[PDB]
From a paper:
SV40 T-ag is a 708–amino acid protein containing at least three independent functional domains: an N-terminal J domain (amino acids 1–130), a central origin binding domain (obd) (amino acids 131–260), and a C-terminal helicase domain (amino acids 266–625). In the case of SV40, a single virally encoded initiator, large T-antigen (T-ag), can bind the SV40 origin, assemble as a set of two hexameric rings, and cause local distortions (ie, melting) of the DNA. The T-ag obd recognizes the GAGGC-containing duplex DNA at the origin and also binds double-stranded DNA (dsDNA) and ssDNA in a non–sequence-specific manner. In this paper we describe two crystal structures of the SV40 large T-ag obd: one in complex with duplex DNA and one as a dimer in the absence of DNA.
The second crystal structure we report is that of a T-ag obd dimer in the absence of DNA. This structure has been refined to 2.6-Å resolution. The asymmetric unit contains two T-ag obd molecules linked together by a disulfide bond. Although the presence of the disulfide bond is likely an artifact of crystallization, we include it here because it facilitates our description of structural changes associated with DNA binding. Perhaps coincidentally, the obds in this dimer are oriented in a head-to-head fashion and contact one another using the same loops which mediate the inter-obd contacts in the structures of BPV E1. The monomers are related by a pseudo 2-fold symmetry axis with a rotation of 178° between the molecules. The dimer interface contains a mixture of hydrophobic and hydrophilic interactions and buries a surface area of approximately 740 Å2. The T-ag obd–obd interface is nearly symmetric with almost identical residues (18 total) from each monomer contributing atoms to the interaction surface. These residues are from helix αB (Glu166, Leu170, Lys173, and Lys174), residues at the end of helix αC, and residues from the B3 loop (amino acids 213–218). In addition, the cysteine residue bridging the two obds (Cys216) is completely conserved across the Polyoma virus family, and the C216G mutation in T-ag has been shown to be defective in unwinding closed circular DNA. The two obds from the DNA complex structure have the A1 loop in one orientation (flipped “down”), while the three obds crystallized in the absence of DNA have the A1 loop in another conformation (flipped “up”).
Author numbering:
A (entry chain B): 130 to 260
B (entry chain A): 129 to 260
Write the structure that this text describes.
Amino acid sequence: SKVEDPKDFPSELLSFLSHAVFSNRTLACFAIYTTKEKAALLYKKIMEKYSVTFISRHNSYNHNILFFLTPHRHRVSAINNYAQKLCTFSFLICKGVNKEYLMYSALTRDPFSVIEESLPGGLKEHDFNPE
Amino acid sequence: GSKVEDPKDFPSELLSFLSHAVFSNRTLACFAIYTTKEKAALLYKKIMEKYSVTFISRHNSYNHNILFFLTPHRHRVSAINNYAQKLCTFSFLICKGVNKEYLMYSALTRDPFSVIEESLPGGLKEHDFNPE
């Protein structure tokens, strides 16, 4: 497990991410990195639990990354709590997203791919703009 | 609110192939799990591996799923149940010893049930539950 499990997100994505998982500054864009089986499950649980404004599921080579935005702010430790406790096996990494567009956009391109998203045709740059 | 929504037991069509002593000290090598279609999917694999099942099958039961499996050594029912309760912690899950293995499995193949997938193709027959 020290041998098998990712210690973090793919490095291609760490610069779009917040690494202060134990902060108190709340965020409203989060990312979860985990196995494909757990990510399929969480796709729907996080959706229903957090009344997400948006959620998408992504190929990450062997695994999956979920990308989602909440209608209101939350602490990381909080989304980490809920996510870790739903299924208690395998690895899970859940971090804040600082660069919302940039994050979701890399997930739509090689080596990542979209498995599914709550909103047909997902997002674009303009969506992270004004109103 | 669980009480209103969750199955309190296996469907009644199969209650008599089952042991209803979940606190028993008797050990068994045939169990069944009643749970949501998604928990059951995870469990199909995680039960297989954890318990090195001789056989496992997964079945539609109306809107949920039933897991049927056989183990290479015996196991107290409480044991298998706890491993199942922990994994995923969210919906309903009923775990019971199976007393009448072949009837259980064979019912699980006829409507209102059906086989989603099984570890052995193409499933089990009467002769499989006989002597050698």
